[PDB]
Design a protein around this nucleic acid. Structure first.
Ligand SMILES: N=C(N)c1ccc(OCc2cccc(COc3ccc(C(=N)N)cc3)n2)cc1
Length: 91
DNA sequence: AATAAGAGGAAGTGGG
DNA sequence: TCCCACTTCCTCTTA
């Protein structure tokens, strides 16, 4: 099954949820969730995964924080903004 | 307060 | 056995 950062990157490349997530600086890999429409994206993540409970943005971001140490995604000091690593962007 | 974003320990679940 | 890659729950902090 797909990993959360690849789910997000695929969305950004495809544009299927442009109202929920967008690039801020795509050359840098920085991207931002919609304040009002991120839950719809979180819901799609849970359904894609087949999880038992409804996915929320809060639980999705709990998981995103775990990439901080390994580096795939880091929190940026801007509202609802994160950054993919160059490795993730290259692959 | 109400609302929202942000945080992480810890326990539980998947699929190796 | 025991790590993967989250998921779920709870309690809290900051703005
Ligand atoms: N269960 C426990 N014992 C426990 C005890 C203490 C905890 O602390 C959590 C914690 C620590 C440090 C910083 C923060 C929040 O940071 C933020 C920064 C910026 C914003 C914003 N831009 N609005 C919002 C939040 N939250 C967590 C659990």
């Amino acid at each position: 099954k797909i990993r959360l950062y690849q789910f997000l990157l695929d969305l950004l490349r495809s544009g299927d949820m442009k109202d929920s997530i967008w690039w801020v600086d795509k050359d840098k890999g920085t991207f931002q969730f919609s304040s009002k429409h991120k839950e719809a994206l979180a819901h799609r993540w849970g359904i894609q995964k087949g999880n038992r409970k409804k996915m929320t943005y809060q639980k999705m971001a709990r998981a995103l924080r775990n990439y901080g140490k390994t580096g795939e995604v880091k929190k940026v000091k801007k509202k609802l903004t994160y950054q993919f690593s160059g490795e993730v962007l290259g692959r």
